[PDB]
């Protein structure tokens, strides 16, 4: 069961990546936005200390929220929403990705 769904999903995903040269750029950005959050929590687990807690929480929020806006751009960029073009999803990505950096520079 899971072998068939596994190899089916690997092949049907890798063909989709090799078709469009926009998708591997998104996913290459995404994976290293996961590794930033992982080692940034590893600093907390390594030495037991919790003192500048807001400065901990700001970078972690940058990693998670910045991951999510990429996944929304990917979902909206493969299949188009009814009424929204592909020139407007990108501008909304710029504006809403540009508010979040300011409110995570005030917070540290």
């Amino acid at each position: 069961d899971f072998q068939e769904t596994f190899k089916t999903s690997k092949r049907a995903y890798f063909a989709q990546i090799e078709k469009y040269p926009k998708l591997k750029l998104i996913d290459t950005f995404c994976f290293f936005l996961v590794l930033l959050g992982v080692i940034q929590c590893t600093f907390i687990i390594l030495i037991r200390d919790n003192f500048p807690f807001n400065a901990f929480l700001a970078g972690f929020i940058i990693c998670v929220g910045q991951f999510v806006l990429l996944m929304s751009l990917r979902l909206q960029l493969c299949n188009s929403f009814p009424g929204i073009s592909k020139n407007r999803a990108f501008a909304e990505f710029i504006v809403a990705s540009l508010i979040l950096h300011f409110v995570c520079l005030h917070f540290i």
Binding site: S85, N87, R88, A91
Partner: protein, 52 residues
């Protein structure tokens, strides 16, 4: 230091007030309304579409 009923008096001021500046108040309001409509004219007719 001056008291109620013994220092009442008057005070006299002489001044001038031309017919030019008598009519400047409604032209001041009217110039702010006129410079307020043109912002709606420029703001309304200006291209902001991102599609073609």
């Amino acid at each position: 230091n001056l008291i109620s009923q013994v220092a009442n008096g008057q005070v006299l001021i002489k001044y001038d007030y031309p017919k030019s500046s008598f009519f400047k108040k409604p032209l001041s309001i009217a110039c702010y309304i006129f410079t307020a409509l043109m912002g709606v004219f420029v703001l309304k007719t200006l291209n902001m579409n991102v599609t073609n």
